[PDB]
Scaffold this motif. Structure first.
Motif, PDB file in Angstrom:
ATOM      1  N   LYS A  30       1.190  -1.718  -0.213  1.00 51.21           N
ATOM      2  CA  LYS A  30       0.165   0.405  -0.141  1.00 51.21           C
ATOM      3  C   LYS A  30       0.600   1.444  -0.262  1.00 51.21           C
ATOM      4  N   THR A  31       1.112   1.720   0.821  1.00 50.48           N
ATOM      5  CA  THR A  31       1.619   3.048   1.416  1.00 50.48           C
ATOM      6  C   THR A  31       3.515   2.942   0.896  1.00 50.48           C
ATOM      7  N   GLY A  32       4.038   1.910   1.299  1.00 49.84           N
ATOM      8  CA  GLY A  32       5.079   1.299   0.876  1.00 49.84           C
ATOM      9  C   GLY A  32       5.957   2.193   1.924  1.00 49.84           C
ATOM     10  N   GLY A  33       6.115   2.447   3.339  1.00 50.22           N
ATOM     11  CA  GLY A  33       6.757   3.051   3.361  1.00 50.22           C
ATOM     12  C   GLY A  33       6.800   4.180   4.514  1.00 50.22           C
ATOM     13  N   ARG A  34       5.971   4.942   2.878  1.00 54.78           N
ATOM     14  CA  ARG A  34       6.116   6.589   3.384  1.00 54.78           C
ATOM     15  C   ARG A  34       5.107   6.829   3.844  1.00 54.78           C
ATOM     16  N   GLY A  35       4.298   6.757   5.195  1.00 53.68           N
ATOM     17  CA  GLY A  35       3.438   7.077   5.471  1.00 53.68           C
ATOM     18  C   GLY A  35       2.381   7.144   5.438  1.00 53.68           C
ATOM     19  N   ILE A  36       1.125   8.112   6.147  1.00 55.90           N
ATOM     20  CA  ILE A  36       0.180   8.970   5.700  1.00 55.90           C
ATOM     21  C   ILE A  36       0.101  10.652   5.367  1.00 55.90           C
ATOM     22  N   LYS A  37      -0.042  10.562   3.426  1.00 51.53           N
ATOM     23  CA  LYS A  37      -0.223  12.186   3.698  1.00 51.53           C
ATOM     24  C   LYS A  37       1.236  13.074   4.064  1.00 51.53           C
ATOM     25  N   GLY A  38       0.601  14.199   3.508  1.00 55.14           N
ATOM     26  CA  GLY A  38       1.726  15.139   3.801  1.00 55.14           C
ATOM     27  C   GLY A  38       2.975  15.657   2.890  1.00 55.14           C
ATOM     28  N   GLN A  39       4.271  16.155   3.105  1.00 52.55           N
ATOM     29  CA  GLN A  39       4.459  17.065   1.359  1.00 52.55           C
ATOM     30  C   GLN A  39       5.609  15.568   1.536  1.00 52.55           C
ATOM     31  N   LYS A  40       5.791  15.242   2.093  1.00 53.97           N
ATOM     32  CA  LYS A  40       6.570  13.962   1.921  1.00 53.97           C
ATOM     33  C   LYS A  40       6.199  13.047   1.899  1.00 53.97           C
ATOM     34  N   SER A  41       5.457  12.258   1.494  1.00 54.97           N
ATOM     35  CA  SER A  41       4.067  11.281   0.500  1.00 54.97           C
ATOM     36  C   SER A  41       4.176  11.291  -0.676  1.00 54.97           C
ATOM     37  N   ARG A  42       4.727  12.648  -1.094  1.00 55.62           N
ATOM     38  CA  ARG A  42       4.311  13.330  -2.109  1.00 55.62           C
ATOM     39  C   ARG A  42       5.295  12.307  -3.264  1.00 55.62           C
ATOM     40  N   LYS A  43       5.833  12.651  -4.817  1.00 52.93           N
ATOM     41  CA  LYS A  43       6.989  12.652  -5.460  1.00 52.93           C
ATOM     42  C   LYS A  43       7.655  13.183  -5.523  1.00 52.93           C
ATOM     43  N   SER A  44       8.861  12.948  -5.210  1.00 49.52           N
ATOM     44  CA  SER A  44       9.573  14.133  -4.688  1.00 49.52           C
ATOM     45  C   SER A  44      10.154  14.783  -3.786  1.00 49.52           C
ATOM     46  N   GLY A  45       9.188  14.628  -2.602  1.00 48.21           N
ATOM     47  CA  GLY A  45       8.675  15.000  -1.669  1.00 48.21           C
ATOM     48  C   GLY A  45       9.478  15.816  -0.887  1.00 48.21           C
ATOM     49  N   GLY A  46      10.895  15.213  -0.946  1.00 51.49           N
ATOM     50  CA  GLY A  46      12.327  15.464   0.081  1.00 51.49           C
ATOM     51  C   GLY A  46      12.233  16.980   0.728  1.00 51.49           C
ATOM     52  N   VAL A  47      12.574  17.915   0.975  1.00 50.54           N
ATOM     53  CA  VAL A  47      12.951  19.586   0.901  1.00 50.54           C
ATOM     54  C   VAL A  47      14.266  19.708   1.529  1.00 50.54           C
ATOM     55  N   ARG A  48      14.649  20.673   0.777  1.00 44.08           N
ATOM     56  CA  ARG A  48      16.259  20.922   0.373  1.00 44.08           C
ATOM     57  C   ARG A  48      17.146  20.891   1.395  1.00 44.08           C
TER      58      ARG A  48
END
Length: 48
Positions: A30-48
Motif C-alpha cells: 500500500k503506502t510502501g513506508g512513506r506514511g500517510i499524507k503530507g509533503q514527504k509522502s508525495r513524489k519528489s517530496g524531500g525538502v532541500r
RNA sequence: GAACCCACUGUCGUUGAAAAGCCAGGGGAUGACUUGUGGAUAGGGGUGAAAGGCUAAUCAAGCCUGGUGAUAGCUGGUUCU
C-alpha cells in the motif's frame, strides 16, 4: 566441482532488493513506508 | 392590413419533431427598411445605436500545434507468503 552449475557466491554476499507496494504480506504494501499524507509522502517530496 | 423581417404573453416539450421549437394571440411593414452574389477588417487584436454583446453549437481574451510529461505543502491509488 568446477562446473557452471556448481558455482555459488559466499554467504551474505547477495541480498534481495526491496519491492514496495506488492501486497499485505510483504510488509511494505500500500503506502510502501512513506506514511500517510503530507509533503514527504508525495513524489519528489524531500525538502532541500 | 397580406407577403417579408421580428420575438411581447400563455400552453405544450425538457432522455423533445427540434443541442432553442410548435400552437393561439403580438410588433414593423417607403424605410435609421428587407435581401442575393463577391469583397475588407484577426486575438490584448477586430467590430460594437454599448449587453462585456459578436468574432464557425466555444469568449472578462477564439482555435490548432509546440515549451510539455508545466507546477500542485492538495485528493485518490499502490498487486504473493
Amino acid at each position: 566441482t568446477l562446473r557452471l552449475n556448481e558455482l555459488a557466491p559466499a554467504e551474505g554476499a547477495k541480498r534481495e532488493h526491496r519491492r514496495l507496494g506488492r501486497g499485505i504480506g510483504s510488509g511494505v504494501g500500500k503506502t510502501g513506508g512513506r506514511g500517510i499524507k503530507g509533503q514527504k509522502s508525495r513524489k519528489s517530496g524531500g525538502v532541500r
